[PDB]
Amino acid sequence: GLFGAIAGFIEGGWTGMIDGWYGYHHQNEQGSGYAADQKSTQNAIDGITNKVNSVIEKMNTQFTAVGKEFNNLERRIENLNKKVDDGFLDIWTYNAELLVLLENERTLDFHDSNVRNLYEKVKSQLKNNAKEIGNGCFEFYHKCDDACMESVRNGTYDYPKYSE
Amino acid sequence: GLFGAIAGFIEGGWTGMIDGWYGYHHQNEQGSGYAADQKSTQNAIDGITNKVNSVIEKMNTQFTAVGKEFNNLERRIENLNKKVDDGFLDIWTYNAELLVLLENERTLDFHDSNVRNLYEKVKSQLKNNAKEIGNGCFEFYHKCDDACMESVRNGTYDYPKYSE
Amino acid sequence: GLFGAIAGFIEGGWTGMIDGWYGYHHQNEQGSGYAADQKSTQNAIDGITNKVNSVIEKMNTQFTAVGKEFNNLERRIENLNKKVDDGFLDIWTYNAELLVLLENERTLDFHDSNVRNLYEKVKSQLKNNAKEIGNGCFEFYHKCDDACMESVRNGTYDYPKYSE
Amino acid sequence: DTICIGYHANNSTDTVDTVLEKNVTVTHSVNLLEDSHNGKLCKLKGIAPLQLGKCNIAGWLLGNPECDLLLTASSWSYIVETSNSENGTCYPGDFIDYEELREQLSSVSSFEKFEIFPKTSSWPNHETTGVTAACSYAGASSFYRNLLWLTKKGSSYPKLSKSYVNNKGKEVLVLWGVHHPPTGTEQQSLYQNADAYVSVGSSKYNRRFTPEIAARPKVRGLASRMNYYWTLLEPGDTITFEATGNLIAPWYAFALNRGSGSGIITSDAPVHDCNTKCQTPHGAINSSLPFQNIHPVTIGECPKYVRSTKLRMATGLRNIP
Amino acid sequence: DTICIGYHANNSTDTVDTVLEKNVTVTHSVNLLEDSHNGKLCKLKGIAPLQLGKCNIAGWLLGNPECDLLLTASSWSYIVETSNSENGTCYPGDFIDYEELREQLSSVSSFEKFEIFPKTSSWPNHETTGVTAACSYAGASSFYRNLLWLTKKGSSYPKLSKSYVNNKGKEVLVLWGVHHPPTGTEQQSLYQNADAYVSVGSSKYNRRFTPEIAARPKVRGLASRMNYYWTLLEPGDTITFEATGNLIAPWYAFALNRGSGSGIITSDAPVHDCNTKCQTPHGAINSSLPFQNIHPVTIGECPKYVRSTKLRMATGLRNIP
Amino acid sequence: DTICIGYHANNSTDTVDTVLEKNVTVTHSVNLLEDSHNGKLCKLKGIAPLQLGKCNIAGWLLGNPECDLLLTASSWSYIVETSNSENGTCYPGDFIDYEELREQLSSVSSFEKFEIFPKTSSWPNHETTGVTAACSYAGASSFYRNLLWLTKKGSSYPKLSKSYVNNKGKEVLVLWGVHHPPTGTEQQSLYQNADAYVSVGSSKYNRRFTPEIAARPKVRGLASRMNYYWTLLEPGDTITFEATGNLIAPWYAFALNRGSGSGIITSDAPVHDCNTKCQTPHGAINSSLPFQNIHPVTIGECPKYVRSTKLRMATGLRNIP
Numbered sequence A, B, C: 001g002l003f004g005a006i007a008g009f010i011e012g013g014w015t016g017m018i019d020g021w022y023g024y025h026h027q028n029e030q031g032s033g034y035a036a037d038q039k040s041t042q043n044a045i046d047g048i049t050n051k052v053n054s055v056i057e058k059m060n061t062q063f064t065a066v067g068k069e070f071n072n073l074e075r076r077i078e079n080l081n082k083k084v085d086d087g088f089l090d091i092w093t094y095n096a097e098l099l100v101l102l103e104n105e106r107t108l109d110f111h112d113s114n115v116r117n118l119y120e121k122v123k124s125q126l127k128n129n130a131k132e133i134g135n136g137c138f139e140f141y142h143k144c145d146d147a148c149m150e151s152v153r154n155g156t157y158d159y160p161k162y163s164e
Numbered sequence D, E, F: 001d002t003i004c005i006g007y008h009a010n011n012s013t014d015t016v017d018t019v020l021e022k023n024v025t026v027t028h029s030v031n032l033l034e035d036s037h038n039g040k041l042c043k044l045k046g047i048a049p050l051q052l053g054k055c056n057i058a059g060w061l062l063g064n065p066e067c068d069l070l071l072t073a074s075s076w077s078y079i080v081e082t083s084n085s086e087n088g089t090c091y092p093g094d095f096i097d098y099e100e101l102r103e104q105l106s107s108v109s110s111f112e113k114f115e116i117f118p119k120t121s122s123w124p125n126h127e128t129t130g131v132t133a134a135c136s137y138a139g140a141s142s143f144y145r146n147l148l149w150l151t152k153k154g155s156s157y158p159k160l161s162k163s164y165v166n167n168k169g170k171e172v173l174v175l176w177g178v179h180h181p182p183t184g185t186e187q188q189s190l191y192q193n194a195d196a197y198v199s200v201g202s203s204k205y206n207r208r209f210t211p212e213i214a215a216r217p218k219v220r221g222l223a224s225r226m227n228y229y230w231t232l233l234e235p236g237d238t239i240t241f242e243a244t245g246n247l248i249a250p251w252y253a254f255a256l257n258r259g260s261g262s263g264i265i266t267s268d269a270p271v272h273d274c275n276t277k278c279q280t281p282h283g284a285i286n287s288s289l290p291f292q293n294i295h296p297v298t299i300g301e302c303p304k305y306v307r308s309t310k311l312r313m314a315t316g317l318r319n320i321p
């Protein structure tokens, strides 16, 4: 991955998290569970939706009858016609194949970037109140209950509140 | 943003800085003010100038009279001519539209990346002689005068000269 | 560089390292030398190879006789034929020129990304057992022999085995 | 106490290709390539196609006896020929500018056949009853329904002159033919005049025909030939026929408003009451996606044809459960 | 004491579209789409177009009496016809290969009209004075300025033979016509000979014409027709006319150097002394940008035509004041 | 106490362009643009082209006396005309649908010349000995090898009727000609019938020719003209000739099986024993790369033609030694 998170230092995905593309897994004394980050998921969705629609809707054509008919003394213009059809076919096939190859790469780089940005957002919030395991997990140096876990997910986490 | 700086952990731009795309805001006892990073600005400018010129100048065209005239027993080749003109219209319209959408995304990613690279360049030279506040600001653990700030902007900053 | 490593905080390349694209230079009491990382090099190679084969092999090529012959009362369809050939010329020249420009940018950004990802991979392994000099170099806070250096390159480096 | 950052995974087996890597499994994806069709020939612009059945366009216009049971509407958005359209010009010869006529008739909005030169009052001094085994109706010698074979009545073929004025407020399609006996003997037997000629004229069209008498290989048992000609008579214009022999005269003609930019589809697929924006010879297809691999030949507002068997776009991310 | 890293902002309202997001406000941008024109027809390659005004190309070449006030330079980069160009062949008939000739004249250098067969000395034994109400000038019957109508002198029309050799060091465009009376009565009245013919030949062109006497609808009051023919006579070559009647003789012809790759524009926009690299029927446009939405049918070195209403490229960054 | 992360560098001088920066030195790269050719005309897909020597295709087909070769090869993938192919129709006149024939003969998988109407037994009632100074072999008047000039025997030219049935199991190319005297005097001298005509017909082809008598400039010393015609006769079909004069009769014809989709290259480059998938007039080119700047008009499976002088794709990374 271009940004090093997906299939990167975060080795795999979570089938447990069903409600979003990106999110959190928490473990504390009250229990464990998955929660999706709604802001980053919904932005990614908005983004990809606009991409797909751009590729689809920018294609506009006029009413056209492709086929043409020529007698046996018209062979030259018949082959001209064939050269036009085949030329358009070569261009559209090549371009469509590459557009999908190239834009598929970018879409995966996009998801990878979103995951990395989310990770570093949490990292910057926790600072030294938590330890970095490396698999995308932070181990707290203090007790963190559901309300604490939520402040982290909410981006509202209170750093000075823990010197414990 | 793909690189997480613009509209990222740096939330907004500076209308105060008129002389460059990316730069610094400094605060000390002598005063405050904006200073643009000249190297990173000019490098970005050279790049974007080259991108635009490529899109514009790579288009080479020959003197062409597009229109053609056909009588009422020439309907087939008249429609062949129309199929060619329209086919060219569909191709250029599609490619032009997607080229701009895709490359606009890349230009914005380019700007985001440049801001981040500048931030981490400053961060790596200052190290622990300053505190990382967030929103792109470093709070110094020593006194930094106008002469000191310029060394930071110039990338010549002297770390061992300050232990406090 | 988009990812800030190549011509970045790592200023130059190694003519000394002949066996791979990305790798390591180590110095300890036993000696110094270059070693290439084979996993990341080979991955990059697989990728770039796939990119190249895509650009070349996605091009459909059918047997075609491009030329046409017209008598002196056929000038209009002769010019129609010319409009088709020139029209295909404009499209293919423009698209190929931009495809190479754009994908060259992406290929360099890819290498830059790979270098950065590898650097951060080593860094997370070493943690506080070493000092980050910059220029891509880590100075150990302990003694590291050839067997130890190999563990870093192998990604098997043992953190708790080294204190001090 | 730990919190982890991660990403979605599921049981999806969808794969896409990327420039760096083939066959990557992703959580979600969408198809950009229209890969299916409905197996029917449908209406284009709310209008059904012309179906010619056993007959091709020439047979239909001339009134080939095999075309009698065809039901023609007053409008069509395109024309359908099948692999069963064999019944054309049953009298051997050349149909002039035939491909052009087919093209220019591919769509029309108010089409009517009418009797331009009525059989009963038009030719008192010529025989109108001529038939041939080459044009057969249920095993019996017959002739085109829309034309009349004029031969001599008794010993003579008097010079004929006939004009039609187009008062229909639209274009009128007029077809006729010229017969070419193999021998001077047959010429006199039919038209009596060895020196015979045909002239047709309008405000635009002007042409003169003479019989070409020559020995030829037999086609459908005939060494004779019959050539077919047509013109579109503009509103208000007049067309005039003169002949001393060999004219295969208009009986019925067609009044119409030509549409434009349509064409002819050759398909054995059944015609149905559905509507579509894109018609293919295999069947109709959805026009919403940008690309289609169904068929290189289409009529409508259509996705671009590509050689691709697969174009699939990643929406979600790498699936790594 | 603090130092901050940040980026530029301004008052720019410029918006662009991106693949992930529509309508993004940015600090700087450039337009790739040329959406305006100057409303004029301008010079291409430093040369003004041929303007035909009231007349179309046929009227101009034949010398239709209404085209007397048009003016032709010795060169032009293209040809402009208007919606007012109606004055063509005023004597009804067919102009053969007319579209081809129009194309071959679309740009020329070194163009000159000259008198190929002077009216006064060329036809001592024939009447040259023929006119018609069909080609009228200022309320009086007239004829094409560049052609001459030869009729019988007294009771006799002797066979004529006339030749021209091209010494002009460039191509010579020669136009002529063949007249077709409605009745043999008229044939004898004008050309005196029932068996009359016209023959034209050169190193390339070979044809013999016969008058076709037939009933035809009246066009501009005439049941007669006059067909128009042309050839490009190569430098050094000879062209020979022989007739016993029905020839409409060349009087003036044109020597020229044909250009190539230009065309014909139909526009009512005023012609001016401005220069352009790209001309559209609406007006001239800048050729600098890669794309233009003004018009698909153009002449020049032109941006590619697209359906886009906006193509705008981000240069600066996301504007967040 | 140190380990460092870095990247490869070398002595490579290769440069690429990127959208952000020109002239970037990289460690590795590959070329996408085929900029060279082998300077030869080669076999296309393992079959040699037809070489016509002194003659062009018309001269070769008609048997111009200067085209005497070892033999027409029995198959070819395409056709080569040179700057030395000068010997065409040595009797001046028009070759009808000549470009069409050239296209349709551009590749064949079997070709044989045969005597369709043997000179010795075919024309007992006509003179076969006609020659002309316009077609000369070794300083003496001669004629086309593949055609026969039929003139009147004694005072009489009886109507001739001659048929050929195609038993060859493939197409037969039949060529013939029609002679056009400048004067009726010459018409009577050769043909005696002034009303003479030629008729050619098959199940498909039907056409009638009459001589067009006109005064014309001399070409190769002749004011006379000769026009050339052809048809492809299908296996099993019959072609029949009837003439009262002016027929230049088939002597030899060609039996053949057409390939499809080839063309003509005009080059003086020598034909060689090399093989290629793409032939250019400059030389053969390699088909592996997607683009080529050698020449726009090619024959084969060819890279797309572009104006680029350089297309080079970075594979390795920025080279910073």
Ligand SMILES: CC(=O)N[C@@H]1[C@@H](O)[C@H](O[C@@H]2O[C@H](CO[C@]3(C(=O)O)C[C@H](O)[C@@H](NC(C)=O)[C@H]([C@H](O)[C@H](O)CO)O3)[C@H](O)[C@H](O)[C@H]2O)[C@@H](CO)O[C@H]1O
Pocket (backbone or CB within 6 Å): D129, D130, D131, D132, D133, D134, D141, D149, D151, D180, D181, D182, D186, D190, D221, D222, D223, D224, D225
């Ligand atoms: C006129 C006639 O009956 N002639 C007979 C000969 O033709 C016949 O030998 C055979 O004739 C066949 C042609 O017959 C038709 C046809 O096409 O079916 C008969 C049609 O009635 C006649 N139509 C008209 C209006 O006259 C038609 C017509 O003459 C030609 O189509 C015009 O070109 O001919 C056919 O050619 C066979 O190949 C031929 O052997 C014998 C036997 O009776 O004598 C005549 O009665």
Ligand SMILES: *[C@@H]1O[C@H](CO)[C@@H](O[C@@H]2O[C@H](CO)[C@@H](O[C@@H]3O[C@H](CO)[C@@H](O)[C@H](O)[C@@H]3O)[C@H](O)[C@H]2NC(C)=O)[C@H](O)[C@H]1NC(C)=O
Pocket (backbone or CB within 6 Å): F064, F065, F066, F086, F087, F088, F089, F090, F134, F135, F136
């Ligand atoms: C085959 O082609 C060659 C040309 O490649 C013909 O040879 C000669 O062609 C020249 C034209 O370049 C003829 O020139 C003429 O010369 C006479 C005087 O010699 C002059 O009066 C004419 O005005 C013209 O310039 C030349 O006649 C001709 N040679 C002969 C013997 O006729 C050759 O004729 C061609 N042969 C056939 C059978 O096509």
Ligand SMILES: *[C@@H]1O[C@H](CO)[C@@H](O)[C@H](O)[C@H]1NC(C)=O
Pocket (backbone or CB within 6 Å): E064, E065, E066, E086, E087, E088, E090, E134, E135, E136
């Ligand atoms: C063209 O000139 C003719 C006379 O030559 C005149 O009758 C006619 O009205 C002119 N054109 C138009 C559109 O009026």
Ligand SMILES: *[C@@H]1O[C@H](CO)[C@@H](O)[C@H](O)[C@H]1NC(C)=O
Pocket (backbone or CB within 6 Å): E031, E286, E287, E288, E289
């Ligand atoms: C086209 O317009 C003017 C020509 O007067 C030119 O200066 C300008 O640069 C061109 N347009 C753009 C967007 O560059």
Ligand SMILES: *[C@@H]1O[C@H](CO)[C@@H](O)[C@H](O)[C@H]1NC(C)=O
Pocket (backbone or CB within 6 Å): F036, F037, F038, F286, F287, F288
């Ligand atoms: C084409 O053949 C091979 C494959 O590309 C290549 O090695 C060779 O050099 C090419 N030939 C020429 C003459 O460039």
